Design a protein around this ligand. Structure first.
Ligand SMILES: O=C(O)CC(O)CC(=O)O
Ligand SMILES: [Mg+2]
Ligand SMILES: [Mg+2]
Lengths: 296, 296
């Protein structure tokens, strides 16, 4: 059956802005984030404490985390790819961090020269450091429904890596269809294998709409009992590993569906559409949200 | 559970084109339909035999039906609103016609001008003639998941109309979310009420993606056992009852989902994309197919 409430994780300011062609000033980022908080989102991925030399679009991570209004009860997780970034994030006041791995050997190797097993040693250091500081850690498992290099990905394999993340300390793992090649059957098989080893409450789904399958894959996950899904404001984002089509599932199209289902999200659609319109103008782009297009 | 095979009903050349800003030459329509035949679609809504007064985009209906190649096995149904339209269709060689009703009263008044009950008298004569003429007839029930004038529409009222159409001769009734406001739950309640009165094999779904819910509502119908769904080539068309937003579910995105689910469609995706690209160019527009944008 369908959950009664879904926790929506907004990734537009990080996953979205990181993979957008144009860049916006720090004040725009802070304003966009305050607008999503005003819209009622309970968790907003804010920035990434990664080297400016590798991903310059996230270069203002320290000032963004310190400049945003911290609404009551709302979580503002930040990405910390390594120990150095983790220490900076903590020093900047972060209370939740996010680490990312993959269920694909080829993807991991072409992204860090380390095998899936090796990537977990780098994670152990952060998780040990996070535990000593009482900081929460969310995990990202990319290529959960297919890899741009290996093609099909085994469910057992995704279950294996997710389990590792969870036993290592991550209170929540987001299974991501990074290139958007997944379809509901694939989603179903994957989650079925993951749920055997990880409790339902620790799972989240993050689907890309590159092939127009994002919302349908999310619904399958909801029918399977997942109660947390990642999405980006106006469908901002994209994937470096896929032809310049679309990226993240649009938060507005997701809440529209959830409200129709009678599922609580605690999100105000009108105010979410304002945030989307705002960032879209700052970026000189058209929103990828269909609800936004149909509303005005 | 999910059916082993699905009959995709391509409506791009009629539904799609009738609801597009720009128009195209008769030779363009003909070639589009031949390309759609090439791609393997088993049923292609070819044109509409309606007055050029109302919709001039469909004026060339006679020459279009006569000029398109007739591939073995493929069906080329055409719309016939009044008895005179049905007259011309038969003469032009039509072997299948389409009559369109609506579960919404106000809608039947803005569309053609009469009572939902009165509109059944018209359909009777056509169905009667169609029976003498030996022509199979397909029905269209609009506002199946809501109306732009009445708002919510009851599953009972939809079940009522579908039942009337089915007992009156139609071998298949296409239930359509003309404004694309439906969500999975509404689709389920609707299908549920209709399936009580009409066998499943005679049901078809037609969902617009105006709010980005088309593929999800379609997945729900498939999960309910519906095995024929309507879609338009490159997401061609649009709803006259809303802003400048998308219209019909894009056929390429739907076969990608079906192929992903291992469901037989018999459609060649690459040739389908060729067809989509061909028409978008003639229309001087950008495809609304995500799959198209990701493939190239
Ligand atoms: O975590 C990501 O989604 C991307 C990385 O942080 C940036 C990189 O590609 O190096
Ligand atoms: Mg993403
Ligand atoms: Mg339509």
């Amino acid at each position: 059956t369908l959950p009664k409430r879904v926790k929506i994780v907004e990734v537009g300011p990080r996953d979205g802005l990181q993979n957008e062609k144009n860049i916006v000033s720090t004040p725009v980022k802070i304003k966009l984030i305050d607008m999503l908080s005003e819209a009622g989102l309970s968790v907003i991925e804010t920035t990434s404490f990664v080297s400016p030399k590798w991903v310059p679009q996230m270069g203002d991570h320290t000032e963004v985390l310190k400049g945003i209004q911290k609404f009551p009860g709302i979580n503002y997780p930040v990405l910390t790819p390594n120990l150095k970034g983790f220490e900076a994030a903590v020093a900047a006041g972060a209370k939740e961090v996010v680490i990312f791995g993959a269920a694909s050997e080829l993807f991991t190797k072409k992204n860090i020269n380390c095998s899936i097993e090796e990537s977990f040693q780098r994670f152990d250091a952060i998780l040990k450091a996070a535990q000593s500081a009482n900081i929460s850690v969310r995990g990202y498992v990319s290529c959960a429904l297919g890899c741009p290099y290996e093609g099909k990905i085994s469910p057992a394999k995704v279950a294996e890596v997710t389990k590792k993340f969870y036993s290592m300390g991550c209170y929540e793992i987001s299974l991501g269809d990074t290139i958007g090649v997944g379809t509901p059957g694939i989603m179903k098989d994957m989650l079925s294998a993951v749920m055997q080893e990880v409790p339902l409450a620790a799972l989240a789904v993050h689907c890309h709409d590159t092939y127009g399958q994002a919302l349908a894959n999310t619904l399958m996950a909801l029918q399977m009992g997942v109660s947390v899904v990642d999405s980006s404001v106006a469908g901002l984002g994209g994937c470096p590993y896929a032809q310049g089509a679309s990226g993240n599932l649009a938060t507005e199209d997701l809440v529209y569906m959830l409200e129709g289902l009678g599922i609580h999200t605690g999100v105000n659609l009108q105010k979410l559409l304002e945030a989307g319109n705002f960032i879209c103008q700052a970026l000189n782009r058209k929103t990828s949200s269909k609800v936004a297009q149909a509303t005005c």
